């Protein structure tokens with residue numbers, strides 16, 4: 056019975072850790088997304104600058 | 112004993128989930144940091160070009 | 168005599184300018200395609216994690 | 231290594247070492263002349279525990295190392311340091327053995343003759359280079375410009391040299407060395423930043439502030455009027471993002487730092503600005519060609535990447551000299567490599583191997599042979 | 606208050622505040638720069654319940670107060686703290702009103718110009734001083750010595766400054782600030798005492814150990830030989846009687862604490878010992894007068910009450926510099942008051958009131974007028 060309460064304790068520990076990690080993954084992936092999109096926008100603009108250079 | 116075995120199985124499942132999510136977070140973390148290192152580089156360099164506009 | 172040789176090498180570098188552009192453009196396109204596939208990867212991962220959390224909830228009330 | 235026995239071209243500039251092969255357009259291994267040494271002693275094991283750190287390794291390990299300069303304003307501290315850094319350059323960076331390739335080296339203007347004799351002797355004994363030639367960086371920058379007439383302003387990191395050369399002829403009687411260089415710039419900026427509230431002494435912040443000089447610094451068109459309008463100057467004031475992330479804002483200091491070379495009285499030099507040193511240099515020589523010197527001035531060095539030297543140069547010389555003839559400066563982009571380019575140019579022609587300094591000449595006449603073999 | 610409208614003389618030294626009247630030989634109100642604040646909140650009544658505690662009151666109430674430093678190495682935390690301590694000094698300690706007496710103040714060397722502009726502005730608005738003058742403590746210590754030639758080593762509690770002045774003129778190009786001071790001394794001694802078995806963190810023990818430094822500390826003539834003979838050293842080992850009554854015995858640490866300024870590598874500074882900082886400072890300036898600098902070095906600060914700085918100073922400089930001319934240090938007893946004495950000296954002569962910074966000048970040109978009125 057003591058081993059069973061210890062098992063339930065470790066199970067709850069791991070489940071709370073899982074929930075925290077899942078939320079962290081979601082937020083990190085959203086942040087990485089927005090960051091990459093802004094970098095893509097600047098890269099777009101710079102590519103347009105390269106095209107203008109070629110036109111010269 | 113049967114209940115202890117079921118609880119231990121569930122706890123091990125949860126813990127393996129924990130470790131796998133941690134590894135995924137690690138990989139994402141490295142990619143985001145690099146993305147940003149190069150974002151700040153390209154932003155600074157666009158600003159440098161603007162400084163060129165000032166020198167002109 | 169040496170100076171004309173420099174005028175020429177700079178010219179070599181000048182046209183090389185576009186050659187420097189090419190690797191940057193391929194790297195840009197690689198970032199392009201990686202982000203575009205990351206789009207659907209993120210969406211599918213969100214759906215998968217929603218299903219996983221559903222299983223978490225059912226196991227939660229089951230105990 | 232190339233299949234051909236082409237020569238090595240190495241510019242040991244006062245502040246940067248740029249090495250590579252002859253026939254190449256740019257030096258392959260380019261590194262600053264800083265050298266890092268373990269700040270403490272050894273107790274740990276499993277990794278590191280190496281004395282000399284050079285190149286980008288020391289740049290990454292700046293914080294843990296005492297950063298020392300094996301050369302400052304031409305003066306040589308420890309030949310062992312040059313031995314190690316040349317070993318690193320030849321084998322770890324150039325991946326070349328000096329046994330099969332003669333070396334063309336460039337030296338700082340008016341370097342000691344005793345320095346040349348000792349460095350050549352230690353070189354020949356320690357290394358096995360087949361042949362040798364060493365030249366002044368002034369004629370190298372001239373070769374990079376490819377015009378035999380002009381006055382070269384070599385702005386290294388230890389000394390600034392003004393050297394006039396007319397129709398490919400050196401004029402040592404009108405050559406001068408000024409002790410103002412990057413070191414002074416960093417020092418002066420350090421004291422001004424101290425008056426701005428930020429007081430650092432270590433070399434990492436030295437590199438940070440020289441980077442700031444590379445990025446943001448101005449050369450003031452009019453000095454006191456620009457501080458007068460820089461009182462507030464929200465737009466004119468400029469900021470930098472230090473790698474730790476703090477935003478450090480600087481205003482008039484941007485153009486008050488390089489100004490000290492032009493106005494040495496700020497930190498107490500009897501010599502006036504470097505434009506006066508070019509002016510006196512010009513008049514020392516015959517009157518007639520002086521106009522050509524005015525119209526053919528060249529500037530060289532890593533510092534030249536900064537803006538503002540050209541406009542200031544011409545305006546002040548026109549103020550000092552009569553404004554009949556038009557004065558124009560020439561400065562090709564990325565001219566800090568130009569000296570090394572000229573070294574390649576020296577190896578380009580087939581007459582250069584007529585005066586290689588071979589091993590047997592040094593074995594016969596000792597180092598003293600260079601006194602007759604170079605000049 | 607004296608019937609005459611004589612000026613106020615206040616030395617806000619980095620570590621001690623010494624204030625009094627002009628024409629006096631010693632400052633009347635002298636207190637350390639520590640400031641105590643209630644460690645907890647108010648529930649009791651009938652006495653106390655006061656926020657700011659300064660001076661001997663805080664010294665007596667050290668245990669109950671969080672002890673904070675309104676200034677550290679020149680950096681200013683909260684101007685309100687200076688407001689309160691100046692109120693206390695002027696009214697509770699000096700029993701004087703600043704309305705009728707101009708103030709001569711001394712500031713730490715190379716203090717921020719923005720710091721000067723803000724402190725002067727808050728001062729003028731908050732207080733009603735008729736006139737103002739602020740000077741660097743270096744020339745004040747020079748005045749106390751009364752000799753226009755020499756290099757001043759100002760060892761405050763936050764910074765140690767080396768400043769050369771030849772024939773009464775400042776040499777900012779050869780002036781340096783080192784971040785080693787009393788704070789470092791206490792820290793290093795704290796870690797060594799931790800290795801001796803006694804580990805404290807709070808400020809009361811900080812004051813106890815600085816008192817130990819005042820009383821028992823040595824400056825080792827030879828370092829490693831003296832720890833070698835200090836292995837046992839029953840006679841050489843020295844003890845102190847802490848106010849609680851326990852006897853705390855210290856041996857080599859007595860001369861291993863100040864040595865750290867001389868040997869910064871103990872706790873990791875790129876800069877070498879302060880003697881190297883005086884040496885470099887000397888050579889930066891023209892060669893010829895350097896001998897006079899060697900023979901005219903002065904040291905100032907409260908730390909100077911310790912023994913051993915003079916012998917160490919001369920021996921190491923003679924080791925570094927040629928031993929032809931004789932080097933001798935001068936240091937009058939109780940020189941920590943000397944700066945304030947020099948302030949009185951400034952008020953002694955009748956030309957000093959030609960450049961008092963009056964209220965109307967500040968009202969016209971704002972704080973910016975000091976940029977043109979002091980320097």
Ligand SMILES: Nc1ncnc2c1ncn2[C@@H]1O[C@H](COP(=O)(O)OP(=O)(O)O)[C@@H](O)[C@H]1O
Pocket residue numbers: 242243244245246367384385386387412440444530531532533534535536566
């Ligand atoms: N890309 C750059 N932009 C601006 N300044 C630079 C750059 N690279 C180097 N420098 C400056 O050039 C100095 C080194 O000068 P250097 O070129 O070695 O002189 P020399 O021409 O005599 O070899 C350094 O102190 C550094 O501040």
Ligand SMILES: Nc1ncnc2c1ncn2[C@@H]1O[C@H](COP(=O)(O)OP(=O)(O)O)[C@@H](O)[C@H]1O
Pocket residue numbers: 617618619620621742759760761762787815819905906907908909910911941
């Ligand atoms: N009577 C004394 N004996 C020894 N050391 C002292 C004495 N009085 C003060 N000090 C030391 O002097 C330091 C304060 O230096 P201070 O005189 O304020 O520098 P400054 O000269 O820049 O004002 C304190 O940290 C203290 O340790």
Ligand SMILES: [Mg+2]
Pocket residue numbers: 243384385386387530531532
């Ligand atoms: Mg140069």
Ligand SMILES: [Mg+2]
Pocket residue numbers: 618759760761762905906907
């Ligand atoms: Mg002091």
